[PDB]
Design an enzyme around this catalytic site. Structure first.
Site, mmCIF file in Angstrom:
data_model
loop_
_atom_site.group_PDB
_atom_site.id
_atom_site.type_symbol
_atom_site.label_atom_id
_atom_site.label_comp_id
_atom_site.label_asym_id
_atom_site.label_seq_id
_atom_site.Cartn_x
_atom_site.Cartn_y
_atom_site.Cartn_z
ATOM 1 N N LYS A 1 1.675 4.470 -0.859
ATOM 2 C CA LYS A 1 1.163 5.679 -1.476
ATOM 3 C C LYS A 1 1.507 6.851 -0.563
ATOM 4 O O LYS A 1 1.730 6.659 0.635
ATOM 5 C CB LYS A 1 -0.349 5.576 -1.669
ATOM 6 C CG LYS A 1 -1.139 5.374 -0.391
ATOM 7 C CD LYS A 1 -2.610 5.224 -0.688
ATOM 8 C CE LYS A 1 -3.372 4.780 0.550
ATOM 9 N NZ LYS A 1 -4.822 5.030 0.377
ATOM 10 N N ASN B 1 -0.200 7.469 3.082
ATOM 11 C CA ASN B 1 0.182 6.647 4.241
ATOM 12 C C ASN B 1 1.472 7.102 4.934
ATOM 13 O O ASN B 1 1.793 6.630 6.028
ATOM 14 C CB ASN B 1 0.270 5.166 3.851
ATOM 15 C CG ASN B 1 -1.102 4.533 3.610
ATOM 16 O OD1 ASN B 1 -2.137 5.149 3.863
ATOM 17 N ND2 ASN B 1 -1.108 3.301 3.118
ATOM 18 N N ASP C 1 0.812 -1.220 0.000
ATOM 19 C CA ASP C 1 0.000 0.000 0.000
ATOM 20 C C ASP C 1 0.846 1.271 0.000
ATOM 21 O O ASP C 1 0.443 2.281 0.579
ATOM 22 C CB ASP C 1 -0.957 -0.004 1.208
ATOM 23 C CG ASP C 1 -2.152 0.926 1.028
ATOM 24 O OD1 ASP C 1 -2.448 1.312 -0.119
ATOM 25 O OD2 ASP C 1 -2.811 1.260 2.041
HETATM 26 C C1 LIG Z 1 -10.110 -0.880 6.239
HETATM 27 C C2 LIG Z 1 -9.539 0.350 5.513
HETATM 28 O O1 LIG Z 1 -9.536 1.431 6.432
HETATM 29 C C3 LIG Z 1 -8.839 2.553 5.925
HETATM 30 C C4 LIG Z 1 -8.796 3.633 7.022
HETATM 31 N N1 LIG Z 1 -8.673 5.003 6.460
HETATM 32 C C5 LIG Z 1 -7.287 5.388 6.067
HETATM 33 C C6 LIG Z 1 -6.534 6.249 7.103
HETATM 34 O O2 LIG Z 1 -5.902 5.418 8.064
HETATM 35 C C7 LIG Z 1 -5.480 7.080 6.354
HETATM 36 N N2 LIG Z 1 -4.534 7.841 7.210
HETATM 37 C C8 LIG Z 1 -3.419 8.395 6.391
HETATM 38 C C9 LIG Z 1 -2.381 9.165 7.229
HETATM 39 C C10 LIG Z 1 -3.088 10.283 8.025
HETATM 40 C C11 LIG Z 1 -4.246 9.746 8.907
HETATM 41 C C12 LIG Z 1 -5.011 10.930 9.516
HETATM 42 C C13 LIG Z 1 -4.324 11.216 10.864
HETATM 43 N N3 LIG Z 1 -3.535 10.019 11.192
HETATM 44 C C14 LIG Z 1 -2.538 9.995 12.127
HETATM 45 N N4 LIG Z 1 -2.236 11.195 12.662
HETATM 46 C C15 LIG Z 1 -1.266 11.271 13.588
HETATM 47 N N5 LIG Z 1 -0.555 10.225 14.038
HETATM 48 C C16 LIG Z 1 -0.811 9.005 13.541
HETATM 49 C C17 LIG Z 1 -0.074 7.890 14.006
HETATM 50 C C18 LIG Z 1 -0.336 6.600 13.491
HETATM 51 C C19 LIG Z 1 -1.340 6.433 12.508
HETATM 52 C C20 LIG Z 1 -2.081 7.551 12.049
HETATM 53 C C21 LIG Z 1 -1.822 8.846 12.561
HETATM 54 C C22 LIG Z 1 -3.718 9.003 10.139
HETATM 55 C C23 LIG Z 1 -5.200 8.844 8.095
HETATM 56 S S1 LIG Z 1 -10.050 6.091 6.285
HETATM 57 O O3 LIG Z 1 -10.050 6.574 4.897
HETATM 58 O O4 LIG Z 1 -11.261 5.404 6.756
HETATM 59 C C24 LIG Z 1 -9.566 7.424 7.445
HETATM 60 C C25 LIG Z 1 -9.124 8.686 6.957
HETATM 61 C C26 LIG Z 1 -9.038 9.020 5.472
HETATM 62 C C27 LIG Z 1 -8.745 9.698 7.870
HETATM 63 C C28 LIG Z 1 -8.783 9.449 9.259
HETATM 64 C C29 LIG Z 1 -9.219 8.200 9.749
HETATM 65 C C30 LIG Z 1 -9.606 7.185 8.847
HETATM 66 C C31 LIG Z 1 -10.055 5.859 9.448
#
Ligand SMILES: CCOCCN(C[C@@H](O)CN1CCC[C@@]2(CCN(c3ncnc4ccccc34)C2)C1)S(=O)(=O)c1c(C)cccc1C
Length: 330
Positions: free
Chosen positions: A133, A136, A131
């Site tokens: 991209k 992430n 994954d």
């Molecule tokens: C089964 C597929 O599900 C896929 C789940 N999804 C993808 C996200 O994890 C993408 N992520 C890409 C990197 C940035 C962050 C937003 C903030 N975040 C973090 N911010 C700060 N510290 C961290 C430390 C560790 C991990 C994340 C973070 C993760 C979302 S989504 O689109 O639903 C979703 C989005 C689009 C935003 C927020 C929550 C969800 C659940």
């Protein structure tokens, strides 16, 4: 035993289809984490169960400077919760979106840390990430890379073993994934190529809003580069974005080592990368432990709520997930 009452919910960092990420404080300790909260029903309704469990296992089974460390994982009757170290520096997209392009030296630095992490997953854990991209990829408070979201990972892939599942974001898919005739670990190096291309060039290597046309481009169209791009950067990206994985940099038995030896990374001492002895070119200018300046106001402005004895409830819409009893060893 850890529940959702153990945390203070401070700011919404992001939300999507499957749920949200919230900046939290553990009340007993005063520590700050990012809690990813997934809605069990949505996970089930879109067949994301196996991925979500893989995410949980890989997070529990891995230890690397550039992979998100998991502190707790637990479940409620309708939610799965991952409590990980907060990536204070935000997404790479936050910075790339605003600055248009990263310098070659900065992209080299981020690339090195991604390679270090992917080499660990391939060589030590027999894991293909799948994954890779831009979305992430995040930054910690120091400006070092954090790879997030391990749901698409494939476990137990050793050497040249193949995989079949068509998965990943359309714009980032390797040619061999698109061919849908089996693929190997070198799909990760394709992803490194796409992500490093975005960093240095300010756009995707291939784009069309129609997916069928996008896929035609990824499969057939020869890579081009902005003419400001240096020779070494052009060479690395060309090697990483070969259509045929057997011709691709990192596509041979040496795997990551072939990329590590590339002239673009000359002078890079790879143990120093692992040990974070290389000074990040951008240090996130956070002024507090709850500073969220590297997350869109779009998300941070929003109110946090409790929805948008049941401790053994196991239904088909809301199942009792195994291995959601994790607390990292102190
Ligand atoms: C089964 C597929 O599900 C896929 C789940 N999804 C993808 C996200 O994890 C993408 N992520 C890409 C990197 C940035 C962050 C937003 C903030 N975040 C973090 N911010 C700060 N510290 C961290 C430390 C560790 C991990 C994340 C973070 C993760 C979302 S989504 O689109 O639903 C979703 C989005 C689009 C935003 C927020 C929550 C969800 C659940």
């Amino acid at each position: 035993r850890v529940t959702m009452n153990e945390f203070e919910y401070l700011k919404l960092l992001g939300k999507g289809t499957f749920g949200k990420v919230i900046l939290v404080k553990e009340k007993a300790t005063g520590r700050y984490y990012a809690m990813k909260i997934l809605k069990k029903e949505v996970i089930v309704a879109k067949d994301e169960v196996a991925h979500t469990l893989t995410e949980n296992r890989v997070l529990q089974n891995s230890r690397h400077p550039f992979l998100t460390a998991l502190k707790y994982s637990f479940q409620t009757h309708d939610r799965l919760c991952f409590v990980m170290e907060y990536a204070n520096g935000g997404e790479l997209f936050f910075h790339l979106s605003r600055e248009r392009v990263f310098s070659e030296d900065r992209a080299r630095f981020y690339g090195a840390e991604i390679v270090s992490a992917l080499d660990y997953l391939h060589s030590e854990k027999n894991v293909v990430y799948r994954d890779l991209k831009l979305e992430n990829l995040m930054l910690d408070k120091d400006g070092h890379i954090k790879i997030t979201d391990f749901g698409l990972c494939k476990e137990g892939i050793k050497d040249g073993a193949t995989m079949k599942t068509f998965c990943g974001t359309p714009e980032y898919l390797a040619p061999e994934v698109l061919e849908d005739n089996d693929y190997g670990r070198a799909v990760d190096w394709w992803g490194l190529g796409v992500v490093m291309y975005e960093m240095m060039c300010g756009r995707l290597p291939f784009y069309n809003q129609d997916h069928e046309k996008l896929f035609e481009l990824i499969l057939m169209e020869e890579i081009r580069f902005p003419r400001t791009l240096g020779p070494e950067a052009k060479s690395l990206l060309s090697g990483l974005l070969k259509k045929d994985p057997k011709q691709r940099l990192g596509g041979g038995s040496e795997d990551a080592k072939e990329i590590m030896q590339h002239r673009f990374f000359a002078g890079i001492v790879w143990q120093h990368v692992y040990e974070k002895k290389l000074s990040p070119p951008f240090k996130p200018q956070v002024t507090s432990e709850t500073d969220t300046r590297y997350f869109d106001e779009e998300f941070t402005a929003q109110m946090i709520t409790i929805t948008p004895s049941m401790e053994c409830v196991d239904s088909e819409r809301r199942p009792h997930f195994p291995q959601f009893d994790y607390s990292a060893s102190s």
